[PDB]
Ligand binder design. Sequence first.
Ligand SMILES: *[C@H]1O[C@H](CO)[C@@H](O)[C@H](O[C@@H]2O[C@H](CO)[C@@H](O[C@@H]3O[C@H](CO)[C@@H](O)[C@H](O)[C@H]3O)[C@H](O)[C@H]2O)[C@H]1F
Length: 274
Amino acid sequence: LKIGAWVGTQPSESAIKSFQELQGRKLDIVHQFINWSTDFSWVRPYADAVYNNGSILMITWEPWEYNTVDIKNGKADAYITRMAQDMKAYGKEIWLRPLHAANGDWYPWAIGYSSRVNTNETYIAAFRHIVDIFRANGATNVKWVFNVNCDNVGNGTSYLGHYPGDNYVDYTSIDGYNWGTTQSWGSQWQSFDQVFSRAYQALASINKPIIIAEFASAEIGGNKARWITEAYNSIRTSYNKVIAAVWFHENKETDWRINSSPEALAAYREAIGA
Ligand SMILES: *[C@H]1O[C@H](CO)[C@@H](O)[C@H](O[C@@H]2O[C@H](CO)[C@@H](O[C@@H]3O[C@H](CO)[C@@H](O)[C@H](O)[C@H]3O)[C@H](O)[C@H]2O)[C@H]1F
């Protein structure tokens, strides 16, 4: 079980080192989010810091700038091609997670998104197109991460309708959160198992290893410290295809941070292990 995080900001050398110090352990995976108007030259100083630390960089690559119709039709290809050439030249093993949470309704490339422009077909053609361009440019170092949100949210969404095939995927991944009672829509406290079991059952049918790419717990509505202890136990005990757990450390929709309380931090430090 590799331990990773988005550390709440872009992973400069100091942000990586600070989070490592905070959690009392090596970060095996450092997570970054970038959009589709960011070139690799902007990524480079962060990647150099990650690799100099001896970590793997996972990039969630968010095309706010191009929907799946745009992408499948080649309208982003200059930008994709430059990224693939630059990543190949860089040479280091990078985990790339494009077009994530497509079984939700909140990103403009997602199948559930309310413009209705993204379908299983446009999504798969888009994802395959990206991978084809990277392979054409020799970027064998880039490992492809397929993703689902823990719940299917929005019309038309499913765990695998948008799956582009094992020939296009190195890892699958699940994101999900215990929102506790924090959201006025009526969120409730959920254990790790209540959050993740359904998505895991669907992905466990695919012969690829699984990453928990984004997860955290709120403080409100239950005991976050115990939730952390029990979540890592659950991962190790019953989610055996999961090979990495990548916390989402940011005080954002709620205080997802590992140090949202002293008790949560103590639990996290213990749970992640040696
Ligand atoms: C996983 O679920 C999270 C909980 O709901 C949600 O907050 C995450 O949203 C993503 O959050 C990251 C970090 O806040 C954003 O990162 C920003 O990405 C842009 C590139 O698009 C960067 O330029 C910027 O520096 C990053 O902070 C994501 O945009 C956002 O989708 C969700 F992924």
